[PDB]
Amino acid sequence: CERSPDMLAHFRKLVPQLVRILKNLIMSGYSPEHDVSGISDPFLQVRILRLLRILGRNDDDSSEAMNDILAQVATNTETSKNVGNAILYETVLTIMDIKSESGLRVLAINILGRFLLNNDKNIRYVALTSLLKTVQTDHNAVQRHRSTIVDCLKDLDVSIKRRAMELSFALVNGNNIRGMMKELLYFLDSCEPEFKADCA
């Protein structure tokens, strides 16, 4: 499907089969094989989420068919472990990259905001990457994390700081450009040597 779009229509007919397989996998939450950290078949779940995000990204039927599966996964999955957090991030990315419903977008935004406040460096990096990816999509909803984006620039993580700077740059609009100019100048003045050129 990714190589050429001619097979997207042919590969989009198996959307109900993929949804049924994902539902069956979610129902069987316990399994001796592939069950790690309380998530059964995490690789299979990630592949299904990626296929759903890439399948029907510009069609309403594909998004509608997988809308119920995405909603169930967004609420029937626990992100306490790394596998659960990765599955939730993949589901949020698939919802953002597909023509999902307003409720699905709101749930993805809430999940991204919750993961942004997580103290884990990997969780913070994942949240920053999700916010950067969902910059054009749900841009108005991304404006509620302006304080988080500003604070991420001062974070003690090089990857976290870079993600925060990228999010701030991508979130600059025609109204916050004047307000964000002072913040950008301050970040460039007191930025790292490898980020001063990028900030400028």
Binding site: V36, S37, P42, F43, V46, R50, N82, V83, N85, A86, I87, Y89, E90, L93, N122, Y125, V126, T129
Partner: peptide
């Protein structure tokens, strides 16, 4: 093109 936690999960599974 994929989630960051997937790589960590794969590495942990390979180590195990």
């Amino acid at each position: 093109q994929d989630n960051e936690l997937l790589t960590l999960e794969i590495v942990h599974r390979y180590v195990e």
